[PDB]
């Protein structure tokens, strides 16, 4: 790996965006001219951490975001700018409250046991009007819009541009779909080592929002952006691999899954409640859990349970939504899963039923149904909090304030239903 | 007591409003011509209970609301109509889920022990525009509007009319004030036997709303109707009396209070959390508990604690808000208090401090901070649920549905704070 | 077979639209980058079938749409994209509820008797404003607009573009007409093997809609889109052929038709009622049957009957409308016809009269006059239902639901005519 300064000269990069993800998933970046990249690659870009979602004080020394040169992406729509993901450092060490640092820590524990997490994300999003008031396509109106050829091709320019970028970047994109809400789309690409996928997922949201804007549109990954439409998931596909390239999840047990997979699964099931706080991290998230289908079960090739087993050597957690932190969520999933493996956790019986029809009759534990309860579940889950380190309590702090902020709002519903009390 | 038919002939009453209060405090009434009052006074007015907030089925027999002839009030603004409060009966017996029946049951238990609850209510309300969008007086704007002579006299017509009605009805009204929010008023009258006060409180809200409408205005008892203004309380004054006319609360202990009073108080303190669900019964209610001042303490002549001791032989519960059921709330207070007396409950130390300044430093139990948590507190409080009978679980059911209804609403705050997640 | 990956390289195709038609005729497609076509061509593109009109559950495994490489069409207006028609497979076999699969089944039965159905379609459509409120040409206004030269040429650019595409695609287009309603047009091309014509029919609607949109206009195949104008037919021309290449309908009987042709006709007459549900598949469809001409008769070179004999070796079914599924329609027609042939059905006497003038005096069976009755007829016709397989029952299920949805709408007619009852 050559230096970024030399790459800048060779590939015509004039500015670098040195970037990191805070606790709320917000992309924080600094635009640095190429003349300054050498110093910053080694010493890091200085940011006042208290000004981001990092649970820091104005009295603290500036954090130093150290770029991972392997993450470099020349913006495909603006190649004279080089994007870099970074680890936030504080007082000479990675700062445990930064999502990407948290993720790297859990990975290092799994890696030490020769277990390498790989995942793929299904990042649904909506294409909407710039003012956010409606979807971008007024002609996308029918009751079952999923895979609608007409509406898909009406947004060919934006979708095709983005997919072609992903081809060039080497993500191995393989399908673009219109999803089951009007105005909603999904663009899939190959799974990879968790850190690779996490970096891609963070960049992907930024690319989609950016390219949409250039087309006079807007993209949102909001969990439930419209009252009358279903929402955005981020269903996650999970497998564990040895450094020698074998999928520990492949086995001769049920459905081609191994004991390791089922123990991992058992951690997922066992830690589902606190896990919800992290993978459904906003007040808005909880609308998708109250629509009925809010219990903890799996699985099989069945898109009706919290966990689906799509094929051999693979689990799909169907819990995370569009707001899920690209680093915190694989981190939290891995912590729960690793615990499952170590404790030989038992997932219980696979249910081969349609939960939307027969779910009412199944005795199952229930997920937390609002942000506050979910945070409480996270705080009571010591194994999970310990797996995320200091990030967990900082996350719980912020979400509790969001909760109180939300509840303090005077809504129309309140006035409509209470004015005559 | 003569018959209502004979009174109708003598006082020129052409219609009776036979009325009862459901679990949400909603006044349900039927307008019956005088020719039919005799049968209904004895047999009751038939209502389909499932259509009110009574937790009933369409398959149930109609309830029979039996008028309390002693409650009769010729509408002062329309004397040809006679208003009556009623006990809802079902299958030949008072229906334990009806608020007024619940209240009468608790009273009968206290009465059996020669303890007679008397209370006064401070029913603050706002005078607002008919469309509810702003207060009725655009010139009522200053930062400290409390007792504002100008704004008070600007609403003299409406206030004076209502107070004069209360004089004629024999309620012993003694003061009308502009309260500490712009547009907010209060009109006090003498305390009385709980059932008398409860009937008056129910009628009072109706009279104020009715008279406001006749003046082209509107009244609301909503807890927190405006984002920028403080809200409506219903602080309640409480004492217990023997049939021989002695105030059991008067004594030689601290502040002129007796051991009975302090044990009653101890029930209040001891049952405060579940009590909150009943006396802060709406989602909206909880805004007033998050503004800081949400802990459980008393007292002294100090408007800064959950309980104030204004004078000898008197407790003021400063907890209830404008949405409090006129029957359920004295009922719930009495259940908690009676328990305190029977268990010789200990309130702990009176705090002679200003909670708004030093509250942060006091170790005290905290009230529930949202409707859901408050309902949970009610459900966990067996003594309190048992004291209200079947009304308690029916109340909890409805409020839980209100909670889920509220949370399902897509708010602007959500879109503003999450669209860019 | 030069593979799709190879064809993509040489033809410069960057994306494929893998498409299938659902039970409501809706085009469902996935946009796949060339780099992924090889795998999808072999294994199929995955779709959640419950999200389309296929009568499935979210608990079902995804269907796999397997593309027919012989259907490949480079979109003539956007040749970097390659459209493919696909067969829906479920759990390792063709999904009988998918129209194209159902059609292929019926064709295989017939093929097994050396009878190969060939058909051509007259897919009338309107050109309208994007908002759908009026036709595209405000100057197209005369009482008898059929074949209007001015209006035809006023839309030359769009019509000519589409026709030239059909020339290049090898469909053998031969005429473009302005039809007998203002704003209505028709573009004819050579008949072919049923499956070829079906795929083309499906693609054609998409082409016309897409090209219209590129010209700032819009196309609709809605059966009756305007209250004041006549509607869109999809009249179908039908013949049966041996593999040797002879037209089984050509014979010595009347009008140059054979006994086989007449028995086929007899199946059409015999199953006309049930057939109506499939080829008039919407509530809106039934307007064209209540506008008189709704009895079951043929024929001769006479456009006044349900079936017309245009010439030797050919039958024209004048029943299907613009909403007819391009796959279900020929399938249902073939099912009926084959039965006619197997049972030696007697079509009755040819009526050489004008049904518009003398039709009232003829004794003939009447077609069903609304969607509900038509569905009932489909369900009662077990020979027809059995011939379409599971597609029939799923179709009827959806249509019964559409019917209930329609009836549940509060129409202005209802209010105008009932408000004063
Ligand atoms: N063994 C695996 N481990 C982790 N992720 C995987 C694995 N296999 C596939 N994926 C990823 O899961 C995501 C979804 O894949 P997909 O084949 O579309 O699943 P499905 O057919 O169930 O919808 C993709 O990003 C994909 O690359
Ligand atoms: N001994 C009592 N028991 C119950 N309520 C009382 C008692 N004495 C007064 N009240 C009532 O309490 C309410 C408030 O009285 P008020 O004298 O204005 O109290 P404060 O001075 O503390 O504001 C009135 O309705 C009043 O009649
Ligand atoms: N023998 C046949 N079998 C099936 N379809 C046919 C046959 N001959 C013609 N067609 C198709 O029927 C459609 C109508 O043909 P056309 O010549 O316009 O007849 P008409 O003048 O009666 O409308 C055309 O699309 C044509 O391809």
One-character DSSP codes across B286-330: GGGGT----B--B-SS-TTSSEE--STT-EEE---BTT--TTHHH
Question: Is B298 inside a domain boundary?
Answer: yes
Contacts of A254 (CB under 8 A, 6+ apart): A262, A350
CA dihedral C131, C136, C140, C146 (to 10 degrees): -110
A359 touching C, CB under 8 A? Answer: no
Q: What percent of the residues of chain A are helix, what percent strand, and what percent coil, each to the nearest 5?
A: 40, 20, 35
Residue C81 maps to a domain: no
Residue B30 lies in a domain: no
What's the distance, CA B239 to chain centroid?
16
Q: Which residue shows structure tokens 């409180």? A: B201
For tokens 């380190």, the residue is A389
Does A418 contact B282 at a Cβ distance shorter than 8 Å?
Answer: yes
Peptide bond into A411 cis (omega under 30): no
Min Cα–Cα distance to chain A from C29, Å:
5
Q: Is A77 on the interface with C (CB under 8 A)?
A: no
Whether B43 is in a domain gets the answer no
Shortest CA distance from C29: residue in chain A:
A149
In the sheet that C125-128 helps form, which strands lie side by side, from edge to edge? C173-178, C184-189, C125-128, C218-220
Rounded-to-10 torsion of CA C155, C160, C162, C165 = -170
- What does the alpha-carbon distance between residue B264 and residue B338 come to, in Å, rounded to a whole number? 6
Cβ contact B21:B72 at 8 Å: no
Calculate how far, in angstroms, residue A234's C-alpha sits from the geometric centre of ligand 1: 12
CA of C114 relative to ligand 3 center, distance in Å: 22
Q: What does the alpha-carbon distance between residue B48 and residue B57 come to, in Å, rounded to a whole number? A: 9
Using left for φ > 0, alpha for ψ between -120 and 50, and beta otherwise, residue A262 falls in alpha
Q: What is the resolution in angstroms?
A: 2.3
For the annotated binding site of B, the residues are: 122, 124, 174-175, 179, 186, 188-189, 191, 235, 237, 239, 303, 308, 313-314, 316
Give the whole-angstrom CA distance, residue B293 versus residue B305: 8
Domain extent for B320: 106-412
Q: Which atom belonging to ligand 1 lies closest to the Cα atom of A189?
A: 25
- Tell me how far the alpha carbon of residue A283 is from its chain's centroid: 16
Task: Return the HEC string of chain C.
Answer: CCCHHHHHHHHCCCEEEEEEECCCCCEEEEEEEHHHHHHHHHHCEEECHHHCCCCCCCCCCCEEEEECHHHCEECCCCCCEEEEEEEEEECCEECCCCHHHHHHHHHHHHHCCCCEEEEEEEECEEEECCCCCCECCCCCCCCCCCCCHHHHHHCHHHHHHHHHHHHHHCCCEEEEEECCCCCEEEEEECCEEHHHHHHHHHHHHHHHHHHHHHCCCEEECCCCCCCCCCCCEEEEEEEEECCCCCECCECCCHHHECHHHHHHHHHHHHCHHHHHHHHCCCCHHHHHHCCCCCECCECCCCCCCCEEEEECCEEEECCCECCCCCCHHHHHHHHHHHHHHHCCCCCCCCCCCCHHHHHHHCCCCECCCCHHHHHHHHHHCHHHHHHHCHHHHHHHHHHHHHHHHHHHCCCHHHHHHHCCC
| CB proximity A160 to C under 8 Å | yes
Contacting subunits of A (3+ beta carbon pairs below 8 A): B, C
Token pair recorded at residue C279? 């080829």
Q: DSSP letter at A62?
A: P
Q: Is A38 a domain residue?
A: no
CB-CB neighbours of C287 under 10 Å: 17
Number of H helices, E strands in chain B: 14, 16
In this structure, which ligand is nearest to the CA of C308? 3
Point out the ligand nearest to the CA of residue C233: 3
Of A197, A237, A251, the one to substitute when testing ligand 1's pocket (max ligand atoms within 8 A of C-beta) is A237
Residues B108, B94: contact at Cβ < 8 Å? Answer: no
Cross-strand partners of B328: none
Closest-CA residue, ligand 3 atom 23, reads C310
∠ CA B147-B149-B150, nearest 5°, is 130
Tell me if chain C has a CB within 8 Å of the CB of A144.
yes
Helix ranges restricted to H, A170-222: 194-214
In a domain, residue B420? The reply is no
Instruction: Give the separation between CA A330 and CA A240, rounded to whole angstroms.
Output: 12
- Contacts of residue B368 in chain A, CB cutoff 8 Å? none
Residue C188, annotated as binding a ligand: yes
Residues after which chain C is broken (C–N above 2.5 A) are 291
CA distance C148 to C155: 11
Phi, psi values for residue C131, rounded to 5°: -80, 0
Asked whether residue C241 is marked as a ligand-binding residue, the answer is no
Q: Which residues on adjacent β-strands are paired with residue C235?
A: C122
Q: Which letter does DSSP use for residue A305 in this model?
A: S
Contacts of A402 in chain B (CB under 8 A): 417
Which two structure tokens, joined as six digits, stand for B124? Answer: 């603050």
Give every CB contact of residue B349 below 8 A, 6+ residues apart in sequence: none
Pocket test for ligand 2, best of B118, B119, B186, B191 (most atoms within 8 A of CB): B191
Q: By C-alpha distance, which of B149, B138, B216, B152 is closest to B184?
A: B152
Tell me the CB-side half-sphere exposure of residue B129, using CA atoms within 13 A. 8
Query: Domain holding B182: CATH number?
Result: 3.30.590.10
Determine, for residues C58 and A177 on separate chains, whether the beta-carbon distance falls below 8 Å.
no
Structure-derived torsion over alpha carbons of residues C151, C152, C156, C160, reported in degrees to the nearest 10: 160
Number of domains in chain A: 1
SS3 B228: coil
CB B392 within 8 A of CB B385: yes
Closest CA to B253 of B237, B264, B269: B264
Is C322 part of a structural domain of the chain?
A: yes
The answer to whether B18 and B88 have CB atoms below 8 angstroms apart is no
Cα separation, C17 vs C38, whole angstroms: 13
Cβ-proximal residues to A366 (8 Å cutoff; 6+ apart), any chain: A294, A295, A296
Closest ligand to the CA of B240: 2
Residue A244 has a CB neighbour count (10 Å cut-off) of 6
How many angstroms separate the CA of residue A255 from the nearest CA in chain B?
36
CA atoms within 13 A on the CB side of C232: 29
CA-based nearest residue to B347, from B248, B265, B274: B265
Q: In this complex, is the C-beta atom of C209 within 8 Å of any C-beta atom belonging to chain A?
A: yes
Residue A287 included in any domain: yes
Window 255-284 of C: residues touching A by CB (8 A cutoff) are none
Compute the distance from residue B282 Cα to the ligand 3 centre, in Å: 72
Distances (CA, A) of C350 to C300, C307, C308, C354: 7, 10, 10, 12
CB A287 to CB B407 under 8 A? yes
């Amino acid at each position: 790996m050559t230096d970024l300064a030399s790459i800048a000269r060779e590939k015509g990069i004039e500015f670098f965006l040195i970037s990191f993800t805070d606790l709320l998933g917000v992309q924080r970046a600094k635009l640095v001219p190429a003349r300054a990249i050498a110093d910053m690659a080694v010493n890091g870009a200085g940011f006042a951490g208290f000004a981001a979602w990092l649970d820091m004080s104005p009295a603290d020394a500036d954090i130093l975001a150290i770029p991972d040169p392997e993450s470099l992406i020349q913006l495909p729509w603006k190649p004279s700018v080089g994007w870099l993901a970074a680890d936030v450092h504080f007082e000479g060490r990675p700062f445990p409250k930064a999502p990407r640092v948290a993720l790297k820590s859990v990975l290092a524990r799994a890696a030490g046991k020769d277990m390498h997490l790989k995942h793929g994300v299904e990042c649904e999003f909506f294409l909407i009007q710039p003012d956010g008031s409606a979807i971008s396509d007024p002609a996308d109106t029918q009751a079952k819009p999923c895979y609608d050829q007409d509406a898909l091709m009406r947004r060919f320019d934006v979708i095709a541009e983005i997919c072609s970028y992903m081809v060039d970047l080497g993500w191995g994109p393989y399908q673009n779909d219109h999803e089951d809400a009007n105005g909603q789309f999904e663009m899939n690409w190959d799974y990879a080592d968790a850190l690779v996928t996490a970096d891609r997922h963070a960049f992907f949201k930024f690319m989609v929002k950016s390219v949409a804007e250039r087309h006079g549109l807007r993209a949102t990954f909001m969990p439930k952006p419209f009252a009358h439409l279903t929402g955005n998931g981020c269903h996650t596909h999970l497998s564990m691999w040895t450094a020698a390239g074998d999928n520990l999840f492949e086995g001769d047990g049920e459905l081609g899954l191994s004991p390791t997979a089922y123990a991992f699964l058992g951690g997922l099931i066992g830690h589902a409640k606190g896990l919800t706080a992290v993978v459904n991290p906003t007040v808005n998230s909880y609308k998708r859990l109250n629509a009925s289908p809010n219990t903890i079960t799996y699985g099989g090739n069945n898109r009706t349970h919290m966990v689906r087993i799509p094929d051999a050597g693979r689990l799909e957690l169907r819990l995370p939504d569009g707001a899920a932190n690209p680093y915190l969520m694989p981190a939290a999933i891995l912590a729960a899963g690793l615990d499952g493996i170590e404790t030989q956790a038992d997932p219980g019986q696979r249910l081969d039923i349609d939960m939307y029809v027969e779910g009412h009759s199944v005795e199952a534990e229930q997920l937390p149904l609002n942000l506050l309860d979910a945070v409480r579940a996270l705080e009571a889950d010591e194994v999970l909090a310990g797996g995320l380190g200091a990030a967990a309590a900082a996350f719980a702090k912020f979400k509790r304030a969001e909760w109180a902020d939300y509840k303090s709002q005077l809504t129309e519903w309140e006035r409509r239903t209470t004015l005559d009390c």
